[PDB]
């Protein structure tokens, strides 16, 4: 028993992390096979940060303008291209530590592990979720760009996030590993703001199911709700709409606990109305929304 | 910016995890140099559960009674011995992925990363604190015994915890890597309970400093307190006493934020007496106590390993 913010073991990703330098900019890259992936803004100058033309900046680079260090060894760059907002540097050595891997673009509400890195070296690992407004609430300092987010469900690393920017509210934006930003953000320092964030309702319900699996029932009640009525109430607390897809996804947890999904929805409605009245759920005094239904099954069974 | 419950990168420890089987019991072992460490109760039967005589149970075992698998490779056990509550299996091959390491016993209030493993395979990593009552609030399922906890200093892994058991409240107990239990627990299935827990005051203060560094300031006030006066409040609310050592350790954070410890203590006292009045701090509605002062410095300054 127990329930923790549990990341994937980071070793398979640690072996891929390198340092990339161009000009006076140093950040992290991801060395997979003979390709190093990193944010294209490594080629930005101090005067290129508002309206860089990355095509024009890149055509002026030679392979030797990119310094790539893997531990104490310099990797020789033998080619480069850009794919959306990511730079792909061909190197003359395939990484002998490359794990089985794929690139996946995730949807809001999905969770993943982040390996925060500086100068190509890992500093720590933590769990994150893609927020409904397409930001992530990470923990990142200067030099952390190029750090990646990933899952490792079945010995295969699924890379889903690479870190590019910090908005003034202290939250973070980045791309998938094909270089497409999550959300409407651009890799320019022009003023940008995330939409109002909302709570990931299906994840809160998954976590309430985890609480019952771990033996806690105090928040249940004798009521049910229609899906329509639940959504009318929940949206008044800035919760995301719950879809029939979400209801279907919660079927397994509902089956394991004997609590119908719409009965859990009635419990959540009352929790929003009442608060926790000095109690806690799974060690929290708030409704946690960064555990997916899949995460709960992974950790509780 | 931002602040997360952050574990150490686990790669150095993943390469040490193996599966150990004796009879019908399978659990995890830690393979370092030419020794595999695991809980001594791996030699227990379903009828040795309650009142085992480990000295007696171990004499009947031969090296081949212990099946050690590292991935798909079976390691040949060439000797065995027991140190306190841990079994040491000497194998004929040194682990080529052995990192720089040492065994360290931690103190209550100190934090560490847990690598949860099943069948010798690492499955997840998370950060824990050793509670004042010497339990840890882990997340563990069947087959997780022998999972380990660790810190990293400067490329040196400090192993501090091995998982042994789950108590009826769902919290967990284990040993250091020399087989000494943390807390008043024994490795047999007799009735046992965790004592009343308390809150790690110095860690709460560290986390309040992290909040201030991240722009959360609503709880600051003009007041200061004395160590004596605060500890009277601390005792009243089941908080651990604050010592001068704790004040000294928070010194860096006091200087960096401009809030003296006893200044922050007045903030904490008010939070205890009044609560948080509907507000949150760093995304929590509770006073968080599983970040040490060093954890806050490490995360907010970007230390790497
Ligand atoms: C990674 C770094 C992100 C790190 C820094 C702290 C945690 O994450 N990336 C950058 O700094 C980005 C570089 C550009 C893409 C060229 N820029 C940003 O993240 C900026 C930071 C910023 C914020 C506010 C400012 F007024 C000026 C700069 N974010 C940004 O521009 O948001 C848009 C915006 C909103 C509102 C007003 C103005 C702008 C790095 C970079 C180099 O090496 C690394 O590791
Ligand atoms: C590891 C496993 C611990 C795992 C199990 C879930 C998460 O952690 N270890 C064991 O099961 C221990 C084996 C003994 C040391 C011989 N036993 C316990 O942990 C017991 C389980 C238990 C819990 C609650 C109970 F009510 C009864 C039994 N804990 C315990 O003994 O608590 C004391 C007690 C209190 C009240 C009544 C009776 C006893 C393992 C085991 C084998 O392989 C693994 O991975
Ligand atoms: Cl997804």
Swiss-Prot record, chain A:
Inhibited by pyridone-containing alpha-ketoamides compounds 13a and 13b. In turn, alpha-ketoamide 13b (tert-butyl (1-((S)-1-(((S)-4-(benzylamino)-3,4-dioxo-1-((S)-2-oxopyrrolidin-3-yl)butan-2-yl)amino)-3-cyclopropyl-1-oxopropan-2-yl)-2-oxo-1,2-dihydropyridin-3-yl)carbamate) inhibits SARS-CoV-2 replication in human lung cells. Inhibited ex vivo by michael acceptor inhibitor N3. Inhibited ex vivo by compound 11a and 11b. Changing residue 142 to A: Does not affect ability to cleave and inactivate human TRMT1. Residues 1-301 form the Peptidase C30 domain. It catalyses: TSAVLQ-|-SGFRK-NH2 and SGVTFQ-|-GKFKK the two peptides corresponding to the two self-cleavage sites of the SARS 3C-like proteinase are the two most reactive peptide substrates. The enzyme exhibits a strong preference for substrates containing Gln at P1 position and Leu at P2 position. Residues 1-301 are cytoplasmic. There is a cross-link at residues 5, 90 (Glycyl lysine isopeptide (Lys-Gly) (interchain with G-Cter in ubiquitin)). Changing residue 90 to R: In strain: Beta/B.1.351. Coiled coil: none annotated. Signal peptide: none annotated. Changing residue 49 to A: Does not affect ability to cleave and inactivate human TRMT1. It is found in: Host cytoplasm; Host Golgi apparatus; Host nucleus. The active site is at residues 41, 145. It comes from Severe acute respiratory syndrome coronavirus 2. This is 3C-like proteinase nsp5. Cleaves the C-terminus of replicase polyprotein at 11 sites. Recognizes substrates containing the core sequence [ILMVF]-Q-|-[SGACN]. Cleaves and inactivates human TRMT1, preventing tRNA guanine(26)-dimethylation of tRNAs. May cleave human NLRP1 in lung epithelial cells, thereby activating the NLRP1 inflammasome pathway. May cleave human GSDMD, triggering alternative GSDME-mediated epithelial cell death upon activation of the NLRP1 inflammasome, which may enhance the release interleukins 1B, 6, 16 and 18. Also able to bind an ADP-ribose-1''-phosphate (ADRP). 3CL-PRO exists as monomer and homodimer. Only the homodimer shows catalytic activity. Interacts with host FBXO22; this interaction promotes the proteasomal degradation of nsp5.
